[PDB]
Amino acid sequence: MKKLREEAAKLFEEWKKLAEEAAKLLEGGGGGGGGELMKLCEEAAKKAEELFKLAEERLKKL
Amino acid sequence: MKKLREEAAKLFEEWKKLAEEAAKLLEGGGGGGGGELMKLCEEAAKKAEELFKLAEERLKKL
């Protein structure tokens, strides 16, 4: 929440955002073989989330 | 490359795309503690890439 650092926080905001739509759309009726298979797609938000947690430490003051 | 399935291929196209800009921007001057730390961000394209490979099998005809 400084001024230029917080700008990086928003960057990750879109990463998890697109994952929401791309998720419901992905299985919207294109191809389904296994649950774990598609799980790799949602994992994108899982990883970015882990770092997104500490990313706030250097960005804002939790 | 069917008609509706290929639509899912483009979805992943943006995932790896944003990762390109968000990468150079992330380290544009916001915070740097460790290499592996930021590596978690680029990993997003690594995972989506793995599935993006086979995703073409059910989509188009490689």
Side-chain angles (χ1 to χ4, degrees):
Chain A
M1 195 239 138
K2 173 60 153 162
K3 253 212 171 242
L4 279 301
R5 314 189 129 73
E6 222 200 343
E7 300 279 287
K10 315 204 287 120
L11 305 185
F12 292 134
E13 224 88 60
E14 315 206 61
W15 285 41
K16 199 179 155 256
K17 240 161 106 148
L18 276 170
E20 314 228 81
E21 308 248 323
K24 80 92 126 273
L25 258 181
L26 262 166
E27 315 229 295
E36 175 150 41
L37 180 69
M38 180 240 78
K39 214 182 197 158
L40 280 161
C41 311
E42 243 181 10
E43 287 258 287
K46 236 110 281 162
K47 274 77 190 67
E49 171 267 305
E50 245 211 345
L51 55 92
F52 172 68
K53 169 267 238 76
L54 235 306
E56 323 188 30
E57 185 109 317
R58 58 238 306 279
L59 265 51
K60 49 244 297 205
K61 269 148 106 194
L62 270 167
Chain B
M1 196 239 138
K2 173 60 153 162
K3 252 212 171 242
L4 279 301
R5 314 189 129 73
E6 222 200 343
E7 300 279 287
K10 315 204 287 120
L11 305 185
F12 292 134
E13 224 88 60
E14 315 206 61
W15 285 41
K16 199 179 155 256
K17 240 161 106 149
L18 276 170
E20 314 228 81
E21 307 248 323
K24 80 92 126 273
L25 258 181
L26 262 166
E27 315 229 295
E36 175 150 41
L37 180 69
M38 180 240 77
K39 214 182 197 158
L40 280 161
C41 311
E42 243 181 10
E43 287 258 287
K46 235 110 281 162
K47 274 77 190 67
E49 171 267 305
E50 245 211 345
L51 55 92
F52 172 68
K53 169 267 238 76
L54 235 306
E56 323 188 30
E57 185 109 317
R58 58 238 306 279
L59 265 51
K60 49 244 297 205
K61 269 148 106 194
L62 270 167

PDB file of all heavy atoms in Angstrom, chain B residues 15-34:
ATOM      1  N   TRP B  15      -3.183 -16.988 -20.590  1.00  0.00           N
ATOM      2  CA  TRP B  15      -2.522 -17.369 -19.347  1.00  0.00           C
ATOM      3  C   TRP B  15      -1.012 -17.194 -19.458  1.00  0.00           C
ATOM      4  O   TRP B  15      -0.376 -16.615 -18.578  1.00  0.00           O
ATOM      5  CB  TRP B  15      -2.856 -18.817 -18.989  1.00  0.00           C
ATOM      6  CG  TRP B  15      -4.247 -18.993 -18.459  1.00  0.00           C
ATOM      7  CD1 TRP B  15      -5.382 -18.389 -18.918  1.00  0.00           C
ATOM      8  CD2 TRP B  15      -4.649 -19.826 -17.366  1.00  0.00           C
ATOM      9  NE1 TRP B  15      -6.465 -18.796 -18.178  1.00  0.00           N
ATOM     10  CE2 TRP B  15      -6.042 -19.679 -17.220  1.00  0.00           C
ATOM     11  CE3 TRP B  15      -3.967 -20.685 -16.499  1.00  0.00           C
ATOM     12  CZ2 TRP B  15      -6.763 -20.357 -16.241  1.00  0.00           C
ATOM     13  CZ3 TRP B  15      -4.685 -21.357 -15.527  1.00  0.00           C
ATOM     14  CH2 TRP B  15      -6.071 -21.191 -15.405  1.00  0.00           C
ATOM     15  N   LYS B  16      -0.441 -17.700 -20.547  1.00  0.00           N
ATOM     16  CA  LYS B  16       0.996 -17.601 -20.775  1.00  0.00           C
ATOM     17  C   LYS B  16       1.378 -16.197 -21.232  1.00  0.00           C
ATOM     18  O   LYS B  16       2.507 -15.751 -21.026  1.00  0.00           O
ATOM     19  CB  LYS B  16       1.440 -18.627 -21.820  1.00  0.00           C
ATOM     20  CG  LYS B  16       2.930 -18.922 -21.787  1.00  0.00           C
ATOM     21  CD  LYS B  16       3.315 -19.960 -22.829  1.00  0.00           C
ATOM     22  CE  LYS B  16       4.778 -19.835 -23.225  1.00  0.00           C
ATOM     23  NZ  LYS B  16       4.939 -19.188 -24.556  1.00  0.00           N
ATOM     24  N   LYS B  17       0.429 -15.503 -21.850  1.00  0.00           N
ATOM     25  CA  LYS B  17       0.664 -14.147 -22.335  1.00  0.00           C
ATOM     26  C   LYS B  17       0.848 -13.178 -21.170  1.00  0.00           C
ATOM     27  O   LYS B  17       1.887 -12.526 -21.051  1.00  0.00           O
ATOM     28  CB  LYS B  17      -0.501 -13.688 -23.214  1.00  0.00           C
ATOM     29  CG  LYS B  17      -0.089 -13.333 -24.632  1.00  0.00           C
ATOM     30  CD  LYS B  17      -1.279 -13.339 -25.577  1.00  0.00           C
ATOM     31  CE  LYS B  17      -1.699 -11.928 -25.955  1.00  0.00           C
ATOM     32  NZ  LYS B  17      -2.269 -11.867 -27.329  1.00  0.00           N
ATOM     33  N   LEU B  18      -0.164 -13.089 -20.315  1.00  0.00           N
ATOM     34  CA  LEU B  18      -0.113 -12.202 -19.158  1.00  0.00           C
ATOM     35  C   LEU B  18       1.116 -12.491 -18.303  1.00  0.00           C
ATOM     36  O   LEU B  18       1.682 -11.589 -17.687  1.00  0.00           O
ATOM     37  CB  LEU B  18      -1.381 -12.353 -18.318  1.00  0.00           C
ATOM     38  CG  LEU B  18      -2.589 -11.530 -18.771  1.00  0.00           C
ATOM     39  CD1 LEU B  18      -3.837 -11.956 -18.014  1.00  0.00           C
ATOM     40  CD2 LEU B  18      -2.325 -10.045 -18.577  1.00  0.00           C
ATOM     41  N   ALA B  19       1.524 -13.756 -18.273  1.00  0.00           N
ATOM     42  CA  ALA B  19       2.687 -14.165 -17.496  1.00  0.00           C
ATOM     43  C   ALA B  19       3.958 -13.506 -18.024  1.00  0.00           C
ATOM     44  O   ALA B  19       4.933 -13.341 -17.289  1.00  0.00           O
ATOM     45  CB  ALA B  19       2.830 -15.679 -17.515  1.00  0.00           C
ATOM     46  N   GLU B  20       3.940 -13.132 -19.299  1.00  0.00           N
ATOM     47  CA  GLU B  20       5.092 -12.493 -19.923  1.00  0.00           C
ATOM     48  C   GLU B  20       5.247 -11.055 -19.435  1.00  0.00           C
ATOM     49  O   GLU B  20       6.333 -10.641 -19.031  1.00  0.00           O
ATOM     50  CB  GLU B  20       4.950 -12.514 -21.447  1.00  0.00           C
ATOM     51  CG  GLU B  20       4.523 -13.862 -22.000  1.00  0.00           C
ATOM     52  CD  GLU B  20       5.378 -14.311 -23.169  1.00  0.00           C
ATOM     53  OE1 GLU B  20       6.487 -14.834 -22.927  1.00  0.00           O
ATOM     54  OE2 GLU B  20       4.940 -14.140 -24.325  1.00  0.00           O
ATOM     55  N   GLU B  21       4.154 -10.301 -19.478  1.00  0.00           N
ATOM     56  CA  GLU B  21       4.171  -8.910 -19.041  1.00  0.00           C
ATOM     57  C   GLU B  21       4.230  -8.818 -17.519  1.00  0.00           C
ATOM     58  O   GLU B  21       5.041  -8.079 -16.962  1.00  0.00           O
ATOM     59  CB  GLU B  21       2.932  -8.175 -19.560  1.00  0.00           C
ATOM     60  CG  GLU B  21       2.725  -8.313 -21.058  1.00  0.00           C
ATOM     61  CD  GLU B  21       2.921  -7.003 -21.797  1.00  0.00           C
ATOM     62  OE1 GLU B  21       2.529  -5.949 -21.252  1.00  0.00           O
ATOM     63  OE2 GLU B  21       3.463  -7.032 -22.921  1.00  0.00           O
ATOM     64  N   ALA B  22       3.362  -9.572 -16.852  1.00  0.00           N
ATOM     65  CA  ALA B  22       3.317  -9.577 -15.395  1.00  0.00           C
ATOM     66  C   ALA B  22       4.665  -9.975 -14.804  1.00  0.00           C
ATOM     67  O   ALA B  22       4.967  -9.659 -13.655  1.00  0.00           O
ATOM     68  CB  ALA B  22       2.226 -10.519 -14.905  1.00  0.00           C
ATOM     69  N   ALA B  23       5.472 -10.669 -15.600  1.00  0.00           N
ATOM     70  CA  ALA B  23       6.789 -11.108 -15.156  1.00  0.00           C
ATOM     71  C   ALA B  23       7.781  -9.951 -15.151  1.00  0.00           C
ATOM     72  O   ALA B  23       8.415  -9.666 -14.134  1.00  0.00           O
ATOM     73  CB  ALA B  23       7.296 -12.237 -16.042  1.00  0.00           C
ATOM     74  N   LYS B  24       7.913  -9.285 -16.294  1.00  0.00           N
ATOM     75  CA  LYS B  24       8.827  -8.157 -16.422  1.00  0.00           C
ATOM     76  C   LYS B  24       8.375  -6.988 -15.553  1.00  0.00           C
ATOM     77  O   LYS B  24       9.197  -6.207 -15.070  1.00  0.00           O
ATOM     78  CB  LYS B  24       8.920  -7.712 -17.884  1.00  0.00           C
ATOM     79  CG  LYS B  24       7.760  -6.838 -18.327  1.00  0.00           C
ATOM     80  CD  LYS B  24       8.075  -5.362 -18.150  1.00  0.00           C
ATOM     81  CE  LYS B  24       7.884  -4.590 -19.446  1.00  0.00           C
ATOM     82  NZ  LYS B  24       9.108  -4.616 -20.293  1.00  0.00           N
ATOM     83  N   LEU B  25       7.066  -6.875 -15.355  1.00  0.00           N
ATOM     84  CA  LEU B  25       6.505  -5.802 -14.541  1.00  0.00           C
ATOM     85  C   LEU B  25       6.674  -6.101 -13.055  1.00  0.00           C
ATOM     86  O   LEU B  25       7.008  -5.215 -12.267  1.00  0.00           O
ATOM     87  CB  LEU B  25       5.024  -5.608 -14.869  1.00  0.00           C
ATOM     88  CG  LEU B  25       4.686  -4.422 -15.772  1.00  0.00           C
ATOM     89  CD1 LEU B  25       3.184  -4.333 -15.996  1.00  0.00           C
ATOM     90  CD2 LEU B  25       5.213  -3.127 -15.171  1.00  0.00           C
ATOM     91  N   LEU B  26       6.443  -7.355 -12.679  1.00  0.00           N
ATOM     92  CA  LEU B  26       6.572  -7.771 -11.286  1.00  0.00           C
ATOM     93  C   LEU B  26       7.912  -7.327 -10.707  1.00  0.00           C
ATOM     94  O   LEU B  26       7.965  -6.724  -9.635  1.00  0.00           O
ATOM     95  CB  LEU B  26       6.433  -9.290 -11.175  1.00  0.00           C
ATOM     96  CG  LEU B  26       5.053  -9.809 -10.767  1.00  0.00           C
ATOM     97  CD1 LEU B  26       4.949 -11.305 -11.022  1.00  0.00           C
ATOM     98  CD2 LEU B  26       4.775  -9.496  -9.304  1.00  0.00           C
ATOM     99  N   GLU B  27       8.990  -7.629 -11.424  1.00  0.00           N
ATOM    100  CA  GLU B  27      10.329  -7.259 -10.980  1.00  0.00           C
ATOM    101  C   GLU B  27      10.723  -5.889 -11.525  1.00  0.00           C
ATOM    102  O   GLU B  27      11.885  -5.493 -11.455  1.00  0.00           O
ATOM    103  CB  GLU B  27      11.346  -8.310 -11.427  1.00  0.00           C
ATOM    104  CG  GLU B  27      10.885  -9.740 -11.198  1.00  0.00           C
ATOM    105  CD  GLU B  27      11.938 -10.589 -10.512  1.00  0.00           C
ATOM    106  OE1 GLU B  27      13.005 -10.815 -11.118  1.00  0.00           O
ATOM    107  OE2 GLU B  27      11.693 -11.028  -9.368  1.00  0.00           O
ATOM    108  N   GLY B  28       9.746  -5.170 -12.067  1.00  0.00           N
ATOM    109  CA  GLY B  28      10.010  -3.853 -12.616  1.00  0.00           C
ATOM    110  C   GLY B  28      10.564  -2.894 -11.581  1.00  0.00           C
ATOM    111  O   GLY B  28      11.081  -1.832 -11.923  1.00  0.00           O
ATOM    112  N   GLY B  29      10.453  -3.270 -10.311  1.00  0.00           N
ATOM    113  CA  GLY B  29      10.950  -2.422  -9.241  1.00  0.00           C
ATOM    114  C   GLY B  29       9.974  -2.314  -8.087  1.00  0.00           C
ATOM    115  O   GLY B  29       9.725  -1.222  -7.576  1.00  0.00           O
ATOM    116  N   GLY B  30       9.417  -3.449  -7.675  1.00  0.00           N
ATOM    117  CA  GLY B  30       8.469  -3.454  -6.578  1.00  0.00           C
ATOM    118  C   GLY B  30       9.012  -4.143  -5.343  1.00  0.00           C
ATOM    119  O   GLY B  30       8.870  -3.641  -4.229  1.00  0.00           O
ATOM    120  N   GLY B  31       9.638  -5.300  -5.540  1.00  0.00           N
ATOM    121  CA  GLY B  31      10.195  -6.041  -4.423  1.00  0.00           C
ATOM    122  C   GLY B  31      10.948  -7.279  -4.869  1.00  0.00           C
ATOM    123  O   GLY B  31      10.445  -8.068  -5.666  1.00  0.00           O
ATOM    124  N   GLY B  32      12.162  -7.449  -4.353  1.00  0.00           N
ATOM    125  CA  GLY B  32      12.969  -8.601  -4.714  1.00  0.00           C
ATOM    126  C   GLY B  32      13.681  -9.207  -3.522  1.00  0.00           C
ATOM    127  O   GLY B  32      14.592  -8.603  -2.959  1.00  0.00           O
ATOM    128  N   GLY B  33      13.261 -10.408  -3.134  1.00  0.00           N
ATOM    129  CA  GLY B  33      13.876 -11.077  -2.001  1.00  0.00           C
ATOM    130  C   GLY B  33      14.669 -12.301  -2.411  1.00  0.00           C
ATOM    131  O   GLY B  33      15.789 -12.508  -1.947  1.00  0.00           O
ATOM    132  N   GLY B  34      14.085 -13.118  -3.283  1.00  0.00           N
ATOM    133  CA  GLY B  34      14.758 -14.321  -3.738  1.00  0.00           C
ATOM    134  C   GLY B  34      14.319 -14.741  -5.127  1.00  0.00           C
ATOM    135  O   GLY B  34      13.225 -14.393  -5.571  1.00  0.00           O
TER     136      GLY B  34
END
